[PDB]
Design a protein around this motif. Structure first.
Motif, PDB file in Angstrom:
ATOM      1  N   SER A   1       0.815  -1.215   0.000  1.00 38.38           N
ATOM      2  CA  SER A   1       0.000   0.000   0.000  1.00 38.38           C
ATOM      3  C   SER A   1       0.856   1.276   0.000  1.00 38.38           C
ATOM      4  N   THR A   2       1.979   1.278   0.748  1.00 36.88           N
ATOM      5  CA  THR A   2       2.865   2.444   0.805  1.00 36.88           C
ATOM      6  C   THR A   2       3.972   2.353  -0.241  1.00 36.88           C
ATOM      7  N   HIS A   3       4.129   3.429  -1.008  1.00 37.10           N
ATOM      8  CA  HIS A   3       5.169   3.559  -2.021  1.00 37.10           C
ATOM      9  C   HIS A   3       6.077   4.720  -1.642  1.00 37.10           C
ATOM     10  N   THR A   4       7.385   4.516  -1.736  1.00 37.34           N
ATOM     11  CA  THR A   4       8.346   5.547  -1.345  1.00 37.34           C
ATOM     12  C   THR A   4       9.105   6.145  -2.532  1.00 37.34           C
ATOM     13  N   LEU A   5       9.056   7.492  -2.682  1.00 35.94           N
ATOM     14  CA  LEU A   5       9.901   8.203  -3.648  1.00 35.94           C
ATOM     15  C   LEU A   5      11.175   8.522  -2.837  1.00 35.94           C
ATOM     16  N   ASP A   6      12.336   8.045  -3.306  1.00 39.95           N
ATOM     17  CA  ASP A   6      13.612   8.187  -2.610  1.00 39.95           C
ATOM     18  C   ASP A   6      14.689   8.783  -3.519  1.00 39.95           C
ATOM     19  N   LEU A   7      14.975  10.086  -3.316  1.00 46.10           N
ATOM     20  CA  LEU A   7      15.978  10.822  -4.061  1.00 46.10           C
ATOM     21  C   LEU A   7      17.100  11.260  -3.123  1.00 46.10           C
ATOM     22  N   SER A   8      17.218  10.569  -1.975  1.00 41.33           N
ATOM     23  CA  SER A   8      18.245  10.839  -0.970  1.00 41.33           C
ATOM     24  C   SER A   8      19.684  10.633  -1.497  1.00 41.33           C
ATOM     25  N   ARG A   9      19.874   9.906  -2.616  1.00 44.09           N
ATOM     26  CA  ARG A   9      21.221   9.702  -3.198  1.00 44.09           C
ATOM     27  C   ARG A   9      21.860  11.012  -3.673  1.00 44.09           C
ATOM     28  N   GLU A  10      21.046  12.065  -3.819  1.00 42.15           N
ATOM     29  CA  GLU A  10      21.478  13.392  -4.263  1.00 42.15           C
ATOM     30  C   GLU A  10      22.017  14.227  -3.094  1.00 42.15           C
ATOM     31  N   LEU A  11      21.722  13.839  -1.857  1.00 38.97           N
ATOM     32  CA  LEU A  11      22.088  14.624  -0.680  1.00 38.97           C
ATOM     33  C   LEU A  11      23.566  14.871  -0.501  1.00 38.97           C
ATOM     34  N   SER A  12      24.422  13.845  -0.703  1.00 38.04           N
ATOM     35  CA  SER A  12      25.866  13.955  -0.483  1.00 38.04           C
ATOM     36  C   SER A  12      26.493  15.099  -1.272  1.00 38.04           C
ATOM     37  N   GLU A  13      26.217  15.182  -2.592  1.00 39.69           N
ATOM     38  CA  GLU A  13      26.741  16.272  -3.420  1.00 39.69           C
ATOM     39  C   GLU A  13      25.994  17.596  -3.219  1.00 39.69           C
ATOM     40  N   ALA A  14      24.684  17.569  -2.863  1.00 42.16           N
ATOM     41  CA  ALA A  14      23.954  18.815  -2.581  1.00 42.16           C
ATOM     42  C   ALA A  14      24.603  19.503  -1.368  1.00 42.16           C
ATOM     43  N   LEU A  15      24.932  18.734  -0.314  1.00 37.68           N
ATOM     44  CA  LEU A  15      25.561  19.300   0.879  1.00 37.68           C
ATOM     45  C   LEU A  15      27.025  19.654   0.630  1.00 37.68           C
ATOM     46  N   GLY A  16      27.731  18.827  -0.142  1.00 34.53           N
ATOM     47  CA  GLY A  16      29.120  19.086  -0.509  1.00 34.53           C
ATOM     48  C   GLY A  16      29.276  20.425  -1.214  1.00 34.53           C
ATOM     49  N   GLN A  17      28.344  20.727  -2.155  1.00 32.23           N
ATOM     50  CA  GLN A  17      28.296  21.948  -2.951  1.00 32.23           C
ATOM     51  C   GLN A  17      27.970  23.192  -2.116  1.00 32.23           C
ATOM     52  N   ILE A  18      27.230  23.037  -0.994  1.00 29.33           N
ATOM     53  CA  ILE A  18      26.953  24.129  -0.055  1.00 29.33           C
ATOM     54  C   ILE A  18      28.304  24.557   0.563  1.00 29.33           C
ATOM     55  N   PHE A  19      29.142  23.570   0.969  1.00 26.75           N
ATOM     56  CA  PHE A  19      30.471  23.864   1.499  1.00 26.75           C
ATOM     57  C   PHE A  19      31.313  24.534   0.443  1.00 26.75           C
ATOM     58  N   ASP A  20      31.354  23.966  -0.798  1.00 23.42           N
ATOM     59  CA  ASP A  20      32.156  24.494  -1.919  1.00 23.42           C
ATOM     60  C   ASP A  20      31.840  25.958  -2.233  1.00 23.42           C
ATOM     61  N   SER A  21      30.552  26.351  -2.159  1.00 18.22           N
ATOM     62  CA  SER A  21      30.108  27.720  -2.450  1.00 18.22           C
ATOM     63  C   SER A  21      30.657  28.764  -1.477  1.00 18.22           C
ATOM     64  N   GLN A  22      30.755  28.424  -0.180  1.00 18.66           N
ATOM     65  CA  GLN A  22      31.229  29.351   0.867  1.00 18.66           C
ATOM     66  C   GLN A  22      30.275  30.574   1.001  1.00 18.66           C
ATOM     67  N   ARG A  23      28.975  30.368   0.677  1.00 18.10           N
ATOM     68  CA  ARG A  23      27.920  31.384   0.713  1.00 18.10           C
ATOM     69  C   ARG A  23      26.914  31.011   1.782  1.00 18.10           C
ATOM     70  N   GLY A  24      26.413  32.014   2.489  1.00 20.35           N
ATOM     71  CA  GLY A  24      25.419  31.841   3.544  1.00 20.35           C
ATOM     72  C   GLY A  24      25.968  31.259   4.833  1.00 20.35           C
ATOM     73  N   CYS A  25      27.283  31.411   5.058  1.00 18.30           N
ATOM     74  CA  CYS A  25      27.974  30.910   6.243  1.00 18.30           C
ATOM     75  C   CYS A  25      27.578  31.668   7.508  1.00 18.30           C
ATOM     76  N   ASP A  26      27.687  30.997   8.663  1.00 21.27           N
ATOM     77  CA  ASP A  26      27.401  31.555   9.980  1.00 21.27           C
ATOM     78  C   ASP A  26      28.479  31.096  10.981  1.00 21.27           C
ATOM     79  N   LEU A  27      29.619  30.595  10.476  1.00 23.97           N
ATOM     80  CA  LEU A  27      30.727  30.125  11.294  1.00 23.97           C
ATOM     81  C   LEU A  27      32.048  30.394  10.587  1.00 23.97           C
ATOM     82  N   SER A  28      33.020  31.000  11.285  1.00 23.01           N
ATOM     83  CA  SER A  28      34.352  31.253  10.729  1.00 23.01           C
ATOM     84  C   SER A  28      35.331  30.241  11.278  1.00 23.01           C
ATOM     85  N   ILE A  29      36.091  29.580  10.391  1.00 24.18           N
ATOM     86  CA  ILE A  29      37.083  28.576  10.773  1.00 24.18           C
ATOM     87  C   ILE A  29      38.458  29.054  10.323  1.00 24.18           C
TER      88      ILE A  29
END
Ligand SMILES: [Zn+2]
Ligand SMILES: [Zn+2]
Ligand SMILES: [Zn+2]
Lengths: 119, 123
Positions: A1-29
């Motif tokens: 009865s339950t069907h799952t749409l799963d596009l979670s395989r895209e998460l690793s590069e979506a989050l990686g690209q947030i780091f790569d951009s260096q935009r919208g940061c709230d922490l200085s390292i």
């Protein structure tokens, strides 16, 4: 009865690209290399606080953190920080020593045990 | 010779739990039913702007967005918003029409295509 749409395989590069951009940061390292601030990066606390591997970077928005590293391990820092987003990291025999030292220093326990196996 | 440590399987629930917490938000989402503000949620622009499915919520931090939904589709809004984080969504025969309507109106094109196909399979 339950069907799952799963596009979670895209998460690793979506989050990686947030780091790569260096935009919208709230922490200085700042990266201290033998007393001098050789490198700098910015982080996203919303992503980092959701990751136990990045517990050394668990701070409130607007904070500043200082990391200390040895000169030979400087080319590996960007990869370590991106790994806190993507949760993926490529390790070779020429980089294992540096990732083991970095993971031990910052308490990234999954990465620390993975590098220890490769030593 | 390269070895890959891959713990990316944890990402879906790590991001889903950020939405569930409703802490550290920078976006207000009002859900409007028949002219009245029936329910509310808060979002994280850092996560939403990285997702093409969540286009209708691409705003600057501190913004307020209003979503108009039919009364019958109110129990599905939380799951639609959580899906913008986790990139996973559970669909049944009783919920497919509401997800198809929500996805179409807000341009979540992957979900829109999935609901259209699932409906053909279920019926
Ligand atoms: Zn089926
Ligand atoms: Zn291997
Ligand atoms: Zn359809």
């Amino acid at each position: 009865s339950t069907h799952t749409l799963d596009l979670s395989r895209e998460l690793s590069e979506a989050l990686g690209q947030i780091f790569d951009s260096q935009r919208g940061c709230d922490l200085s390292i700042s990266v201290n290399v033998q007393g001098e601030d050789a490198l700098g990066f910015c982080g996203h606390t919303v992503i980092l606080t959701a990751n136990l591997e990045a517990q050394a970077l668990w701070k409130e928005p607007g904070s500043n953190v200082t990391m200390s590293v040895d000169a030979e391990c400087v080319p590996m820092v960007r990869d370590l920080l991106r790994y806190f987003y993507s949760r993926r990291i490529d390790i070779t025999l020429s980089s294992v020593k540096c990732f083991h030292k970095l993971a031990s220093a910052y308490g990234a326990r999954q990465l620390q045990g993975y590098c220890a196996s490769l030593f």
